[PDB]
């Protein structure tokens with residue numbers, strides 16, 4: 001069914017119930033894959049960002065005002081809004097650098113070849129691409145869930161776990 | 170080295186961080202020896218954690234002490250005199266390097282046909298036991314440094330029948 | 334993490350965005366004007 | 368084997384019990400390796416049984432114990448906790464089997480036209496040091512069991528000026 | 532000219548001269564490190580200036596004795 005995209009794994013297979021990777025063009029599928037990779041990268045970072053500041057609030061490690069009322073990371077919109085604005089601005093600037101340099105079709109290769117490590121063979125690479133994609137998918141789901149849950153009952157993740165009797169700490 | 174005992178589903182060849190990239194057969198043989206020995210030790214260690222929870226020997230390790238008073242987990246490395254621990258260590262070493270009270274020919278059965286399958290099974294069990302021994306060590310040591318810190322009481326938390 | 338520390342790190346980010354916008358402007362022109 | 372290194376004038380070839388007849392050169396290599404290692408360790412012993420009698424380092428070996436109070440000799444063992452002893456034993460082994468922290472090439476000199484004379488000096492010193500350690504252990508242990516035995520209450524009896 | 536014994540020992544240290552890596556080498560790490568050093572310096576300067584107030588750090592004479 002698929003056209004050679006490195007994705008697709010044993011748990012399910014080629015997951016495409018709605019029929020999008022048959023009604024698209026050769027360039028459209030490339031853009032879809034890029035969209036996937038990028039969303040995943042951001043998400044993964046955002047999940048780690050939700051976890052660590054919130055925990056540092058739970059452990060009294062940043063003072064008694066860090067995420068003041070509850071401890072939710074969605075509370076930065078109340079305490080320090082301009083900091084969040086400037087951070088989104090810096091992200092936007094570096095991503096404008098991306099949009100300028102990278103050309104249509106790439107938009108994912110940061111040319112970070114020597115600055116980091118990489119698998120030496122070729123099969124392992126295919127595996128690492130599949131991994132990046134899978135971690136990104138799981139992170140997308142996790143971020144959506146965290147945001148929805150916190151907007152439902154204003155309460156941090158670890159505390160929502162502690163209450164309601166889902167952990168043992 | 171993509172075809173050597175240890176390749177089993179789901180993960181075909183689990184060398185993600187490129188360790189078998191540029192190595193000769195000697196180094197991979199050393200790695201396999203370390204893996205097999207580690208696995209065997211881990212399996213014996215897990216069995217050792219479980220069994221003293223419902224049975225203790227009838228002798229008296231160390232001058233006093235007695236085998237039925239010693240704590241069960243990460244402790245008992247500080248409740249047995251150091252000389253006895255050193256002697257046990259060196260005896261295990263004698264069995265390890267010299268291979269002494271550990272090579273009896275009645276210990277190498279004729280695995281008619283099934284040799285590779287049984288080698289693969291032994292390696293896989295070693296892997297599982299290595300992870301299990303890590304979990305047991307973490308739970309015990311953490312709940313020893315600060316009683317609690319996990320909520321889960323008891324040392325072998327998982328088999329509640331032993332009431333421990 | 335007091336008010337002073339938050340303001341300090343936010344100032345660091347403001348410096349970052351200023352340098353970033355200057356660099357982005359330089360990259361755009363320099364290229365479109367070989 | 369009556370021409371290999373290790374023959375001096377008092378007792379030229381020492382082998383009364385015939386422990387080196389019919390052996391292959393591989394073994395005699397292993398035997399010489401054991402002799403050299405034991406000799407070096409015995410020298411370091413006969414030097415570590417003396418130094419603490421007038422100079423204790425100062426640090427804390429374990430969380431509560433101080434190397435200012437632990438008695439010297441076959442008594443310090445049961446003071447340092449068994450985990451610390453083990454953590455040492457394994458590091459000494461790391462230096463002994465994998466040859467780490469002990470193979471720095473600038474420690475191996477070029478004895479030139481003396482490499483057959485300094486090796487013999489090393490071996491003979493080791494032979495003497497082994498017997499010295501035997502005597503020190505005898506005195507130490509015999510008095511640690513029954514205090515006052517042999518009458519010479521001190522440790523390094525032969526060096527009275529130290530005030531053992 | 533006048534090879535001395537010391538000179539023989541120290542020769543390898545000065546042996547290679549003018550050797551260089553091509554193509555920007557490890558310059559970006561130098562940039563990262565310089566920036567982090569600048570951040571550290573402004574942190575220290577603003578703490579000492581009392582322009583950055585942190586819990587448990589009072590810039591005043593204390594009783595060490």
Ligand code: CLA
Nearest residue numbers: 203206207210258259261262265266453454457460461464
């Ligand atoms: C004096 C006794 C003795 C001797 C001579 C040997 C000899 C050997 N062992 Mg060995 N071993 C012993 C006791 C001994 N063992 C005991 C009691 C255990 C625990 C079951 C093991 C577990 C063991 C494993 C798992 C492996 C060896 C390996 C080896 C071989 C070389 C590596 C080595 O020992 O350097 C030691 C070098 C080190 C760097 C030591 C590592 C220290 C670890 C990481 C942490 C130490 C934790 C702490 C100090 C000990 C707590 C446990 C203790 C209280 C029981 C060699 C044949 C290795 C092998 O066959 O080839 C690779 C190998 O993989 N041994």
Ligand SMILES: CC(=O)O[C@H]1CC(C)(C)C(=C=C/C(C)=C/C=C/C(C)=C/C=C/C=C(C)/C=C/C=C(\C)C(=O)C[C@@]23O[C@]2(C)C[C@@H](O)CC3(C)C)[C@](C)(O)C1
Nearest residue numbers: 044045047112115116117135138139141142143145146157
């Ligand atoms: C820099 C350079 O030069 O080279 C670089 C190149 C390159 C490639 C960038 C490098 C890399 C790789 C990197 C950085 C890889 C990073 C990968 C990363 C960071 C992957 C995160 C996954 C997180 C997940 C899946 C979250 C799960 C979370 C899940 C599934 C949850 O359930 C969360 C949860 O909330 C729910 C939803 C409900 C809550 O009630 C309960 C909890 C809280 C449990 C290197 C090695 O750095 C070198």
Ligand SMILES: CC1=C(C#C/C(C)=C/C=C/C(C)=C/C=C/C=C(C)/C=C/C=C(C)/C=C/[C@@]23O[C@]2(C)C[C@@H](O)CC3(C)C)C(C)(C)C[C@H](O)C1
Nearest residue numbers: 381382383384385405408409412415440443497498500501
């Ligand atoms: C330093 C220190 C410690 C220590 C220690 C250590 C490691 C001490 C080590 C002691 C050690 C290593 C003692 C070896 C003796 C070997 C001997 C005597 C060999 C004799 C061999 C003899 C006498 C002769 C043999 C033969 O002549 C025969 C019989 C016939 C001939 O044909 C052949 C030859 C010539 C070979 C403690 C205790 C751990 C704690 C303390 O706090 C600090």
